[PDB]
Tab-separated table of C-alpha atoms and ligand atoms in Angstrom:
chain	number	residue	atom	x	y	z
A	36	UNK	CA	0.000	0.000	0.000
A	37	UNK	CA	1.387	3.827	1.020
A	38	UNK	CA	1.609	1.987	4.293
A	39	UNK	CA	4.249	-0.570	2.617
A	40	UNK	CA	6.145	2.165	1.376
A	41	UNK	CA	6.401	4.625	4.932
A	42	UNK	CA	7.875	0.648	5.527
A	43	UNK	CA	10.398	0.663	2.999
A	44	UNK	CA	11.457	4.005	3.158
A	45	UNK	CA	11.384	3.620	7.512
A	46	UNK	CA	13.549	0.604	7.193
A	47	UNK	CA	15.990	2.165	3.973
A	48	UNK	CA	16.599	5.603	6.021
A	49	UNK	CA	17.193	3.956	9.515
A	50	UNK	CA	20.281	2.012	7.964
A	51	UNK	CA	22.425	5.188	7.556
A	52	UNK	CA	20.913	6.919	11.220
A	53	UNK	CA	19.223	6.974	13.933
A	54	UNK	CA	15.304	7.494	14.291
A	55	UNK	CA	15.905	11.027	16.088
A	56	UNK	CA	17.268	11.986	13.192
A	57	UNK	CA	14.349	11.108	10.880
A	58	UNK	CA	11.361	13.161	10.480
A	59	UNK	CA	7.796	12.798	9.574
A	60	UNK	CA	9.059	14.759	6.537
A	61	UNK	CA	11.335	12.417	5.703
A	62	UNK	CA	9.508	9.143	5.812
A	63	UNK	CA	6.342	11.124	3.945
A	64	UNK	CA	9.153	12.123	1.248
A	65	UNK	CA	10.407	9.109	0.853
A	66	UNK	CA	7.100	7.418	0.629
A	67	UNK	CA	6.324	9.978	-1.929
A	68	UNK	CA	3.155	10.963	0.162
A	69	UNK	CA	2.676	14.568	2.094
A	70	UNK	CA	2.630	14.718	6.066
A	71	UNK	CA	-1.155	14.755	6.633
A	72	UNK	CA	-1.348	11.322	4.374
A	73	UNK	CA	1.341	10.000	6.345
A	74	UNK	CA	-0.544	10.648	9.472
A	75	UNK	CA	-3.069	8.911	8.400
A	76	UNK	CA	-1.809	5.531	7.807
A	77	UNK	CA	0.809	6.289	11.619
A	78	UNK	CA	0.040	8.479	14.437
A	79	UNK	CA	3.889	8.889	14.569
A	80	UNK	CA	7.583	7.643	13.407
A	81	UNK	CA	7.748	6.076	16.472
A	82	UNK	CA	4.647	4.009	15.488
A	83	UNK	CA	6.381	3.023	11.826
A	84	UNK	CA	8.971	1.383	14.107
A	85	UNK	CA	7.035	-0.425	16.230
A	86	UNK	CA	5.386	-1.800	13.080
A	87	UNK	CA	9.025	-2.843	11.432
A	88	UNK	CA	10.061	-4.612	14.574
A	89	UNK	CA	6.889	-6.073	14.932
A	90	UNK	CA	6.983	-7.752	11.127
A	91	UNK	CA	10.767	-8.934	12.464
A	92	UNK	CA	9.756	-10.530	15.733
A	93	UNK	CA	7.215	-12.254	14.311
A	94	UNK	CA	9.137	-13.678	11.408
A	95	UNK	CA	11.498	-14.875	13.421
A	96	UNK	CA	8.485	-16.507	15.915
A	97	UNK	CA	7.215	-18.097	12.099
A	98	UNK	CA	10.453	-19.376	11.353
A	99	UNK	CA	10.799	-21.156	14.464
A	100	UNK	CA	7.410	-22.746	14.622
A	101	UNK	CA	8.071	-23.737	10.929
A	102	UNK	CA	11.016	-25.400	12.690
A	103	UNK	CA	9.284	-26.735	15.498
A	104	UNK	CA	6.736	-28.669	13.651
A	105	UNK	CA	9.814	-29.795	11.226
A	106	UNK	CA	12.406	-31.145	12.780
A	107	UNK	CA	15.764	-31.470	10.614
A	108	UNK	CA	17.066	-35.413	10.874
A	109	UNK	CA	20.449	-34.443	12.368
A	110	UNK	CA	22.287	-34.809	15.803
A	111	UNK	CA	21.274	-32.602	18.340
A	112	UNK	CA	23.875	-29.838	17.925
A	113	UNK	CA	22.836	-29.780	14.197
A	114	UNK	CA	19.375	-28.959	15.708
A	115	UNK	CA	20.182	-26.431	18.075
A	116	UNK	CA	22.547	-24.757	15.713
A	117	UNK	CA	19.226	-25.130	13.255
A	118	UNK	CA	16.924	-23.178	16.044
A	119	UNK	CA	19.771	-20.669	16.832
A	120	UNK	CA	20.314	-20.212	13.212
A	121	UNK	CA	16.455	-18.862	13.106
A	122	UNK	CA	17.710	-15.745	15.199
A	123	UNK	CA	21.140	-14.982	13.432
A	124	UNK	CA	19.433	-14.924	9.621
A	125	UNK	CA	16.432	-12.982	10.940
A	126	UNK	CA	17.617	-10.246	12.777
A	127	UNK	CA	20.528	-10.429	10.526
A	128	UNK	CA	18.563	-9.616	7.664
A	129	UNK	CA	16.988	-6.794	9.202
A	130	UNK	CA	20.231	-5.229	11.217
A	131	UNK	CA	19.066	-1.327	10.897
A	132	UNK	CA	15.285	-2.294	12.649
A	133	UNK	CA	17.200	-4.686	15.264
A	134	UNK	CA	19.518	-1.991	16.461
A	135	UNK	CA	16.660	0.744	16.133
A	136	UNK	CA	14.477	-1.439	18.340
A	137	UNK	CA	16.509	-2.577	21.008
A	138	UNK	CA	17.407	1.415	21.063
A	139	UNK	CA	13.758	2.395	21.245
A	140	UNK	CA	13.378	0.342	24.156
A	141	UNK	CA	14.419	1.816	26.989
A	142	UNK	CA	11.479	5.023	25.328
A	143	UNK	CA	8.788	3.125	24.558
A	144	UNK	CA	6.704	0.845	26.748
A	145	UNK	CA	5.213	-0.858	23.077
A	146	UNK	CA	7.934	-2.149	22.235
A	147	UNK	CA	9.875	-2.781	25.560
A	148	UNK	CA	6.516	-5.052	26.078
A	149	UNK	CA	6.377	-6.684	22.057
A	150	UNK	CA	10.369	-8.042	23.169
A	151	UNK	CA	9.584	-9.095	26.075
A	152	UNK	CA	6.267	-11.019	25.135
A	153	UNK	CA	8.136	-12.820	22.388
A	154	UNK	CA	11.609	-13.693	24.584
A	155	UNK	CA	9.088	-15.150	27.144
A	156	UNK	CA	7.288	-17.083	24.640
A	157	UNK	CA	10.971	-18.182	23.074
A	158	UNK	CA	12.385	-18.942	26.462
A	159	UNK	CA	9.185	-20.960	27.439
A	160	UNK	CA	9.461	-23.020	24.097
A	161	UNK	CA	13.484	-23.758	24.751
A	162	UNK	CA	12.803	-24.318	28.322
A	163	UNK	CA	10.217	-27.257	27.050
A	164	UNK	CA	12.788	-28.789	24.645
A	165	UNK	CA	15.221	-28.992	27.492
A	166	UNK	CA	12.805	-30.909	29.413
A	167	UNK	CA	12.128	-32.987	26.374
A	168	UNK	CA	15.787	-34.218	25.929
A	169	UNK	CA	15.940	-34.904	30.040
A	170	UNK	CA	12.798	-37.027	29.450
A	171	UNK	CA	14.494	-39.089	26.523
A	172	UNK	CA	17.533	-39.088	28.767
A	173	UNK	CA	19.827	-37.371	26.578
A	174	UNK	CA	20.024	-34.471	28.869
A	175	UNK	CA	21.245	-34.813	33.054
A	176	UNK	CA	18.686	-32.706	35.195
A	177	UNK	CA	21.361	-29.533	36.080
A	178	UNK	CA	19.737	-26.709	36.762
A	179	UNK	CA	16.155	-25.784	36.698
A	180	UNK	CA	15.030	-25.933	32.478
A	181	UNK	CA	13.687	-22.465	32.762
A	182	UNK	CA	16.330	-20.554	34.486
A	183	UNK	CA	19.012	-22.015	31.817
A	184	UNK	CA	16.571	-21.146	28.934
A	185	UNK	CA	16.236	-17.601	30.204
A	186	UNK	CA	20.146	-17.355	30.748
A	187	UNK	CA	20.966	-18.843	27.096
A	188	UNK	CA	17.842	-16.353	25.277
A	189	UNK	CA	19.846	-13.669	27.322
A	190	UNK	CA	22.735	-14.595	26.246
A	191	UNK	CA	21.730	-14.819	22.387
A	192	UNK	CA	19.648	-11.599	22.587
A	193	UNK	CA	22.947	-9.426	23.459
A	194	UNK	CA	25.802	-11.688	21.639
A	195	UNK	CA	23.661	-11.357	18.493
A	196	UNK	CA	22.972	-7.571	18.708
A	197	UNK	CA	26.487	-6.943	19.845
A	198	UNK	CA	27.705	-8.630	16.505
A	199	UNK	CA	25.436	-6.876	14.089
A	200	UNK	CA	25.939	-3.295	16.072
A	201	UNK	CA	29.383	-4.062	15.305
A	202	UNK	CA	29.935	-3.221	19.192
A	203	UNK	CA	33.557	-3.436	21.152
A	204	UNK	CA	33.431	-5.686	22.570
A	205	UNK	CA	31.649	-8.601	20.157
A	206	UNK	CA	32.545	-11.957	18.567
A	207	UNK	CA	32.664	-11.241	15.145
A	208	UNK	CA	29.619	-12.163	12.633
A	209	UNK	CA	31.024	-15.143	11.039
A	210	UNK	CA	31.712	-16.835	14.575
A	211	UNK	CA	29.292	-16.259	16.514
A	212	UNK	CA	26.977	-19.156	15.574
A	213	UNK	CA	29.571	-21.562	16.700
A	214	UNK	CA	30.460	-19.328	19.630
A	215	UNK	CA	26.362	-19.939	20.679
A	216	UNK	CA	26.141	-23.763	19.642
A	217	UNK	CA	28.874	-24.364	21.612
A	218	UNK	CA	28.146	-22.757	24.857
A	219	UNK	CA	23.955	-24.368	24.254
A	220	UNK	CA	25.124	-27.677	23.591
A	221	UNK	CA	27.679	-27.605	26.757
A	222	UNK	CA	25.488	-26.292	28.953
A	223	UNK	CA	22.176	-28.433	28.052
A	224	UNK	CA	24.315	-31.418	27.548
A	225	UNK	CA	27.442	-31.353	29.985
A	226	UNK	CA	27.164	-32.646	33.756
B	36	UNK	CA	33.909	17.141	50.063
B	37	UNK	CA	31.259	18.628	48.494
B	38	UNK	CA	31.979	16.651	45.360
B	39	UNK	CA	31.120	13.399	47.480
B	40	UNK	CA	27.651	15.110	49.232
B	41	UNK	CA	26.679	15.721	44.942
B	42	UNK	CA	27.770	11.992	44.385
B	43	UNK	CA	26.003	10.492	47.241
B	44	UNK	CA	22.878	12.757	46.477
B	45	UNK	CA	22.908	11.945	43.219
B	46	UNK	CA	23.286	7.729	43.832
B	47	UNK	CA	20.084	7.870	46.559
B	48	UNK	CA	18.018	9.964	43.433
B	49	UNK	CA	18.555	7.481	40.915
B	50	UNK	CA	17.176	5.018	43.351
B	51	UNK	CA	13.093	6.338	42.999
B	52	UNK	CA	13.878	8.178	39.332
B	53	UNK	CA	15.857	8.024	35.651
B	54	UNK	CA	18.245	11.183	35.733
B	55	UNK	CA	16.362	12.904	32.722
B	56	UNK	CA	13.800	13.139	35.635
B	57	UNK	CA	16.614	14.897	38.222
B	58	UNK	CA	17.665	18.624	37.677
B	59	UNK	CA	21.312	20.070	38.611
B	60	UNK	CA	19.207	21.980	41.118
B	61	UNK	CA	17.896	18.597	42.606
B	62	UNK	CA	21.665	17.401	43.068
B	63	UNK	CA	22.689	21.108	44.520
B	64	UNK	CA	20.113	21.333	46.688
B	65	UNK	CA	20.852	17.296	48.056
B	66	UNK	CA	24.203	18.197	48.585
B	67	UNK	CA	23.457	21.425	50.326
B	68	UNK	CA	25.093	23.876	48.062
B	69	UNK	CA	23.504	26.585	45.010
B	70	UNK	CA	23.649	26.076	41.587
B	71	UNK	CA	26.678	27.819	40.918
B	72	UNK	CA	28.685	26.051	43.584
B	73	UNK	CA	27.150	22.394	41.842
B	74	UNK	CA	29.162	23.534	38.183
B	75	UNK	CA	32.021	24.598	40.326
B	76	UNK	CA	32.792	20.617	40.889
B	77	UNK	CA	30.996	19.225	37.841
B	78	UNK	CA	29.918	20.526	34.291
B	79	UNK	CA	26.289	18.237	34.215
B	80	UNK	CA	24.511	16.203	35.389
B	81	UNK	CA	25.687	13.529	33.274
B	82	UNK	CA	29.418	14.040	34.338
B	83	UNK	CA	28.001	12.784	37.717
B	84	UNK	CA	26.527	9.969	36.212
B	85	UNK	CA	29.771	9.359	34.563
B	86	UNK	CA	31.907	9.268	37.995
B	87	UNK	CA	29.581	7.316	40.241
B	88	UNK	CA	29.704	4.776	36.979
B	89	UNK	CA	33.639	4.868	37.029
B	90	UNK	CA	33.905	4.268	41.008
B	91	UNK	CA	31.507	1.426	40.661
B	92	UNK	CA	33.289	-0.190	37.503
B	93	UNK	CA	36.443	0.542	38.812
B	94	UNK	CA	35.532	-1.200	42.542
B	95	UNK	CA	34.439	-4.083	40.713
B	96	UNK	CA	38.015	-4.480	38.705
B	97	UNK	CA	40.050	-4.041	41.917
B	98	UNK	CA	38.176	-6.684	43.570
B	99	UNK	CA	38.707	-9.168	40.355
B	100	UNK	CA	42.851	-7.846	40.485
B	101	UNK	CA	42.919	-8.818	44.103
B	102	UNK	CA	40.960	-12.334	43.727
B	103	UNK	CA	43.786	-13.011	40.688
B	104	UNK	CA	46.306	-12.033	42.731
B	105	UNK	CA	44.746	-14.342	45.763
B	106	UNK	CA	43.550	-17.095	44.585
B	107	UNK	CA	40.737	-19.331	46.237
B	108	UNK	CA	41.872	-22.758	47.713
B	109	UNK	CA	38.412	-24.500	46.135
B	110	UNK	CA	37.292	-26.577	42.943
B	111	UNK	CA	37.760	-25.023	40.032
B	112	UNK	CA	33.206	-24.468	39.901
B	113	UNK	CA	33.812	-22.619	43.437
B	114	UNK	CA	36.799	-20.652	41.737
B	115	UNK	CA	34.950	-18.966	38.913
B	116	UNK	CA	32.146	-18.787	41.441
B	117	UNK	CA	34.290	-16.588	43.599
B	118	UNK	CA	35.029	-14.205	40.301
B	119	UNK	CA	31.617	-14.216	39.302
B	120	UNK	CA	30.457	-13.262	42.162
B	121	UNK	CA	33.241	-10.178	42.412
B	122	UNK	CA	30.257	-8.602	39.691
B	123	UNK	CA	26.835	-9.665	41.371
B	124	UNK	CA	28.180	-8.130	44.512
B	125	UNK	CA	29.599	-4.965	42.998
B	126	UNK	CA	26.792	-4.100	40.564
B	127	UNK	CA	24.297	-5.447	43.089
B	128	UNK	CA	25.434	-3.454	45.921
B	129	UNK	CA	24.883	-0.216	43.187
B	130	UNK	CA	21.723	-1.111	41.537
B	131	UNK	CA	20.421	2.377	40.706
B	132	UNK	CA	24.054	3.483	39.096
B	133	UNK	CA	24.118	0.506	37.226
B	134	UNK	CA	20.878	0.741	35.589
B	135	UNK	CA	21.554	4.671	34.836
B	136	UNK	CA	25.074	3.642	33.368
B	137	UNK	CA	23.380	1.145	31.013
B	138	UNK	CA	20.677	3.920	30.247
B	139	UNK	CA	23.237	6.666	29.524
B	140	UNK	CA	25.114	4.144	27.310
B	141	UNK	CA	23.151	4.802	24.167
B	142	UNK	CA	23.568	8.799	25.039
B	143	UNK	CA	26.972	9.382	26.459
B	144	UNK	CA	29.873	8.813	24.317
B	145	UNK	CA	32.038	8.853	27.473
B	146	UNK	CA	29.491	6.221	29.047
B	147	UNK	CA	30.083	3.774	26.331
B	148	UNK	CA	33.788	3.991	26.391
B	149	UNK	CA	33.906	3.251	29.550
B	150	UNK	CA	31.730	0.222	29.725
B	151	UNK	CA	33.773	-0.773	26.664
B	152	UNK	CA	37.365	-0.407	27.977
B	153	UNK	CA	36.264	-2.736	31.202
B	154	UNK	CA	34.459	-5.504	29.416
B	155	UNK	CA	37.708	-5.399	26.844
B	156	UNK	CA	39.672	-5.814	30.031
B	157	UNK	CA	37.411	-8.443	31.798
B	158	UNK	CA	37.309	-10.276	28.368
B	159	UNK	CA	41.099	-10.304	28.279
B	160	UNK	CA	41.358	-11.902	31.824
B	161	UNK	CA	38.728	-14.282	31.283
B	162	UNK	CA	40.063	-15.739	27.838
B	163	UNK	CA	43.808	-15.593	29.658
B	164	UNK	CA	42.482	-18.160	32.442
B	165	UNK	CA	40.538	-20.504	29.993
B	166	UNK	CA	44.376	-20.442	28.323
B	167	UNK	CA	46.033	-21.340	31.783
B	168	UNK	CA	43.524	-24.053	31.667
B	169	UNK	CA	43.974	-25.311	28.801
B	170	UNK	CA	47.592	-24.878	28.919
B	171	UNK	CA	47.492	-27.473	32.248
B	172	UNK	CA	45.261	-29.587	30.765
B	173	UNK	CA	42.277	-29.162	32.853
B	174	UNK	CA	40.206	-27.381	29.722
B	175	UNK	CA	39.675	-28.940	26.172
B	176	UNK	CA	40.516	-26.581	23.275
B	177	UNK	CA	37.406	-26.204	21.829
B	178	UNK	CA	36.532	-22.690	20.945
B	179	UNK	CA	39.154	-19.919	20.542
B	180	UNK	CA	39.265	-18.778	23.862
B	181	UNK	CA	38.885	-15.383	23.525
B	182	UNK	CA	35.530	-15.771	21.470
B	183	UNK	CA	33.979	-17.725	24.428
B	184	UNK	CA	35.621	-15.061	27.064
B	185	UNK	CA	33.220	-12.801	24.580
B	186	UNK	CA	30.101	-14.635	24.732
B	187	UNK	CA	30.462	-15.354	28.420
B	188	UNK	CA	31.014	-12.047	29.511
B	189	UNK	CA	28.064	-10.604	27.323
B	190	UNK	CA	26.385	-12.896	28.584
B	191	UNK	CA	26.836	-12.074	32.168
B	192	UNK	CA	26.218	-8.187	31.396
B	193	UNK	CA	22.982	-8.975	30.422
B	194	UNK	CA	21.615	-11.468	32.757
B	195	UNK	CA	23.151	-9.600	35.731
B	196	UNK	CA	21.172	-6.259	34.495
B	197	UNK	CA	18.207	-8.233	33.825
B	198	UNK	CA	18.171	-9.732	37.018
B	199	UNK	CA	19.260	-6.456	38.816
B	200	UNK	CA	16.684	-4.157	37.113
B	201	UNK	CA	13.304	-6.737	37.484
B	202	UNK	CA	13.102	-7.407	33.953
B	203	UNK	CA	10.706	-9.541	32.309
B	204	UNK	CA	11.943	-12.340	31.330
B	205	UNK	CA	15.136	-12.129	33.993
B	206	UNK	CA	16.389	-15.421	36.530
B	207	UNK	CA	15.398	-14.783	39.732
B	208	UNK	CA	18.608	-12.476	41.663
B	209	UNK	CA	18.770	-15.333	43.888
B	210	UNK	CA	19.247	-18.099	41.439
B	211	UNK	CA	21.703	-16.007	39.268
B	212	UNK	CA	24.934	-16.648	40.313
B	213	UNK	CA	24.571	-20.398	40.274
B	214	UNK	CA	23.264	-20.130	36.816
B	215	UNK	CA	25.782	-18.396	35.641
B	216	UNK	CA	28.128	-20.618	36.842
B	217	UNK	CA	26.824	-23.724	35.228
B	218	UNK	CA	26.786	-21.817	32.064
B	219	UNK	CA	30.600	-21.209	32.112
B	220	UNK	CA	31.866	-24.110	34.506
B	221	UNK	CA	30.331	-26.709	31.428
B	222	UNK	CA	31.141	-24.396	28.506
B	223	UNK	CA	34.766	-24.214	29.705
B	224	UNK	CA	35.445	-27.553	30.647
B	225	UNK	CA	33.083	-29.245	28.395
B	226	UNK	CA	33.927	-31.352	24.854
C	1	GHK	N1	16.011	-16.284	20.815
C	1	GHK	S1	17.365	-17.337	21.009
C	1	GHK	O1	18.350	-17.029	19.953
C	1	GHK	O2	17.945	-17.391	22.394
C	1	GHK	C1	16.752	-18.966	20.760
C	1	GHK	C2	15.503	-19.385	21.313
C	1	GHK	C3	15.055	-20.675	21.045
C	1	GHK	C4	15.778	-21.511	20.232
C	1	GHK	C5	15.365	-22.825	20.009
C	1	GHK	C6	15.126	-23.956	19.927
C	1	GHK	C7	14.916	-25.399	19.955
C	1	GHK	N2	14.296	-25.748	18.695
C	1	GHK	S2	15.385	-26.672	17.777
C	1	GHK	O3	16.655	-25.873	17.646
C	1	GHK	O4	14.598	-26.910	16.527
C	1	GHK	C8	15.651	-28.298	18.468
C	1	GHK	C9	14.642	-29.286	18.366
C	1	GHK	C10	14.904	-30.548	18.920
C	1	GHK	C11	16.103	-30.856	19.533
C	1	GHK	C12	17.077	-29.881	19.690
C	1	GHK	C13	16.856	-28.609	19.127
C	1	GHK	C14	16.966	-21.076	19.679
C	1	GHK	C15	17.428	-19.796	19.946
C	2	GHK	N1	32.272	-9.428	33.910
C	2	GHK	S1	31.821	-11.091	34.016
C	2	GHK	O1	30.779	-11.226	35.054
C	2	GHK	O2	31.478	-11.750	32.710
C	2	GHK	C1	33.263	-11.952	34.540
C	2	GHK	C2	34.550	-11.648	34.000
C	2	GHK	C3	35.656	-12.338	34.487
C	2	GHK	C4	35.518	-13.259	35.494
C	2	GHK	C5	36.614	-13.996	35.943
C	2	GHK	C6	37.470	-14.722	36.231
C	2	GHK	C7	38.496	-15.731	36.474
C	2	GHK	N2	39.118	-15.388	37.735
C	2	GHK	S2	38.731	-16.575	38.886
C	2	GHK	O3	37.230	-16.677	38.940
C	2	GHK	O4	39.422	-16.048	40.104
C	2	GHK	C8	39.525	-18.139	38.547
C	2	GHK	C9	40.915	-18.293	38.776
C	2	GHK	C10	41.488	-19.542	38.498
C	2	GHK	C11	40.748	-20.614	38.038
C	2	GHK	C12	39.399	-20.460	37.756
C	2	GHK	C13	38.786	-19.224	38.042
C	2	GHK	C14	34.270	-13.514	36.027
C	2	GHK	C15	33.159	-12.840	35.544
């Protein structure tokens, strides 16, 4: 629609700055609309971002349900490397929205709430796999399922976003896959 | 002095409110001096902000120097327990800085240096140990140690803030630790 296209152009100008430094103005130019039409379709440019990193999170959600219900016929580090894998290409693929949201956070109770709904929902779901693979005996009861999920989604959540931000400290992008599986597998797995 | 009367004024604020909701005249009038006398020992708010942070960061690397200088007689869990612990005690004991310091992160140049230098330092410790223990033969070489030093200490950052600040999702503050532990005691020693 015009409402794909405040989208686009949202998306397009966040990947050279910050959404302070994008008007109204900007995102109607771009979308080749005026400022009242814009207004129409978003109360705000803080709403068009919300909207992005809601179409991200729930990609990523989509992808891993796909997953879920379609288990790849590997061994179980193949698998978890699979389900982290979900994460990495996602937000990946989207790195200006990812570092806008996480940004917009600490502002805005929407979208502090959207993460938070969806890393509870993605730490329940690991939590339950965990508990899966202790059933089938492949995993030793450690520590409580849901307080390891939480700590590995934690864990994920800022390695991953330190990586794309390009942050100092980070392990770089083509590691830090591995640099997850590894530290999953271990700690799931390991006595 | 005076200078510690703004500090201490400033720490007990940032206990019931974000500093974008404390004025310079707030901190003055804490501290018991005007205005004027306030810029005398600091340029903004934010500078204040900026030394509690550095006292707090820099407590929590003199107690890590001092535990590597005196090591534990213990297990090697009960080891990196003790330097885990160095940062759930330090940040813990300074909750309100801690959550302003990550706030101001995103904002203050100076705030993200600083966070940066110490986690580059921490990071460097932390791979340097896994080395020792690899070098004695009580680690596998799995991982280039400085990668997982990366991932663990991320990690850490934010699960420790998480916990610290009541997030949702966050592990419970007294279930942290010992999760954290597991996390790096099987990642480290694990094949
Ligand atoms: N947001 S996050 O990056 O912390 C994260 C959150 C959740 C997951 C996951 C998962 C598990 N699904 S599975 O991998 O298909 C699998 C199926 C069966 C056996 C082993 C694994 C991964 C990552
Ligand atoms: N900022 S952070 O929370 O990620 C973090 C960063 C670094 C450390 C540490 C450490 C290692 N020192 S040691 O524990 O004394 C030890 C000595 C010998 C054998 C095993 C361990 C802990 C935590």
């Amino acid at each position: 629609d015009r409402e794909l296209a405040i989208l686009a152009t949202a998306e397009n100008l966040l990947e050279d700055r910050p959404l302070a430094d994008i008007s109204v103005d900007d995102l109607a130019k771009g979308a080749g609309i005026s400022r009242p039409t814009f207004y129409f379709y978003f109360p705000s440019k803080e709403a068009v971002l919300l909207t992005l990193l809601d179409r991200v999170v729930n990609q990523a959600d989509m992808a891993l349900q796909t997953l879920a219900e379609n288990p790849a016929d590997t061994d179980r580090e193949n698998m978890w490397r699979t389900g982290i894998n979900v994460f990495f290409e996602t937000f990946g693929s989207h790195k200006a929205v990812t570092r806008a949201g996480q940004a917009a956070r600490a502002t805005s109770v929407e979208v502090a709430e959207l993460w938070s709904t969806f890393m509870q929902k993605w730490i329940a779901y690991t939590a339950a796999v965990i508990d899966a693979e202790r059933d089938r005996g492949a995993a030793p009861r450690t520590l409580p399922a849901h307080e390891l999920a939480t700590a590995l989604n934690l864990m994920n959540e800022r390695t991953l976003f330190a990586s794309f931000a390009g942050e100092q400290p980070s392990v770089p992008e083509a590691r830090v896959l591995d640099t997850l599986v590894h530290i999953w597998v271990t700690s799931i797995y390991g006595e």
